[PDB]
């Protein structure tokens, strides 16, 4: 007779879960026609290679492909308390074939698709570099796109998040279903090389100052943070000595993340359209923070490229009330198979702990895995390289130079450590 909260049984709490989707790249022009140069504007006049209802490797996503991905999530039987959605909704077409209004229409379509299918799910979006017109020119002051997405994302975001989004394309937001957890959604397109609007700016849109203040507040309020953004930190794994964002910004952002590694329980990016790991470490090689780059829904590639990805979506598992990452489940669509029979079969690609025999996703666990990758003829690395393209090509091989670039990028996010790795291993 005393109104005490009812104690849960002595069972183990279920893990928490969230989805990560990215790089949808809807092409509304997609249609099958005999002249394969007219299947999709995103192929820019190339003949689509072998187009079907779920897309083509030379095209961005048909609406049916995106719908199949979200329908899979909806019908998966997995519980999830939120979703993160890291940008890039319009297709790869020349700048004159788009407009601000068209970009907003595509982002609206994707947002409303998600809201329609998941009415009870809090979603945390980030802007991508194609989420603006012209592409990549994301500004340092308010804009029609920033205002539009603040309006579109109001169902998921509080007043303060809406205000920062409208001004600079970034926000932080407490996760309603997960007390103690905050999402920081950065606009890393401000740091992306093609952005003329931020040339020579030390702190475009004051995002670094804002990020430092936000992380310091989380530190003192005993929160944990998941960082989400479109373009990742670190180095491109397929090129030599090329930071994904401008070096000055990569160095500066990584310094903030090292300083706040104790608060940051995960970092989640897109843009690359590949499945990559990174481990942020200190200058002496001690692991600090795990970084997860998710592959795209779109399977697009250019004609010059040999490989591409299969469509992917992924799920993370975390410790409730603590937010340590426990696992990652990557799902995919075998696009060739789905197009041949005309039916999608979104399916499990791998569970990270099972694929790699690691205990969890903590920095020390993943650092040890990457040390295994570095061993000669590592079977773990062979598996990783197959998963990098979401199992698009089981015969893809990574020669010595290719492997050095991959492992160096996985392990070394800043210039000094990356270049030292090249020195040792080229
Ligand atoms: C996603 O779904 C696709 C579609 O099903 C799968 O791709 C098929 O994979 C099968 C099995 O690997 C392929 O069949 C094999 O092809 C080998 C030849 O490789 C390439 O060369 C031909 C040109 O001659 C290409 O046209 C072809 O598409 C391949 O890209 C052959 O060596 C195999 O022959 C032998 O295989 C076994 C013995 O191992 C026996 O059963 C056979 O009798 C024969 O002895 C075999 O034919 C098939 O070609 C692929 N199709 C396409 C369209 O690519 C993917 O594997 C799947 N992805 C995942 C991750 O599962
Ligand atoms: C796009 O493809 C068309 C068609 O290519 C032909 O059909 C395919 C199914 C395949 O079998 C190809 O090897 C064929 O060539 C191209 O148009 C044809 O191009 C060839 C060579 O220039 C020519 O002999 C034909 O007369 C052309 N027209 C047709 C109707 O066949 C076209 O060049 C391709 N465009 C691009 C940008 O690649
Ligand atoms: C990071 O924050 C600490 C703590 O400041 C507090 O943070 C919140 C809880 C909020 O309630 C603020 O009003 C608090 O002040 C900052 O520490 C302060 O530093 C000044 C020196 O400049 C010192 O005089 C105060 O006593 C400190 N406060 C406490 C509680 O120790 C710190 O400056 C912030 N760091 C950065 C880089 O911004
Ligand atoms: C998002 O866009 C797709 C098309 O690009 C829409 O689906 C099409 O809707 C029109 C009517 O508006 C139909 O004529 C098409 O046949 C539909 N299907 C396809 C595959 O094109 C979809 O309605 C839009 N969704 C939202 C929420 O706006
Ligand atoms: C769907 O994909 C996977 C293959 O990895 C498998 O679980 C299932 O059997 C596939 N579909 C059918 C019809 O078998
Ligand atoms: Zn993209
Ligand atoms: Zn991008």
From Swiss-Prot:
Known cofactor(s): Zn(2+)
Q: What does the Swiss-Prot or TrEMBL cofactor note state? A: Binds 2 Zn(2+) per subunit.
Q: What is this protein called?
A: Cyclic GMP-AMP phosphodiesterase SMPDL3A
Q: Give EC number(s), comma-separated.
A: 3.1.4.-, 3.6.1.15
Which GO molecular function annotations are given, in alphabetical order? ATP hydrolysis activity; phosphoric diester hydrolase activity; zinc ion binding
Could you say which tissues express the protein in this record? Detected in blood serum (at protein level).
Localization terms from the record:
Secreted
* Reactions the enzyme catalyzes: 2',3'-cGAMP + H2O = 5'-pGpA(2'-5') + H(+); 5'-pGpA(2'-5') + H2O = 5'-GpA(2'-5') + phosphate; a ribonucleoside 5'-triphosphate + H2O = a ribonucleoside 5'-diphosphate + phosphate + H(+); ATP + H2O = ADP + phosphate + H(+)
**Residues where Zn(2+) 1 binds:** 23, 25, 88, 273
**Coiled-coil segments, which residues?**
none
In its keyword annotation, does this UniProt entry include Disulfide bond?
Answer: yes
Gene Ontology biological process terms, A to Z: negative regulation of cGAS/STING signaling pathway; nucleoside triphosphate catabolic process
Q: What keywords would UniProt list here?
A: Disulfide bond, Glycoprotein, Hydrolase, Metal-binding, Secreted, Signal, Zinc
Annotated effect of mutating residue 92 to A/Q: Abolishes enzyme activity
Q: What is the annotated quaternary arrangement, including any partners? A: Monomer. Homodimer; homodimerizes following 2',3'-cGAMP-binding.
One Pfam entry for this protein is: ASMase_C
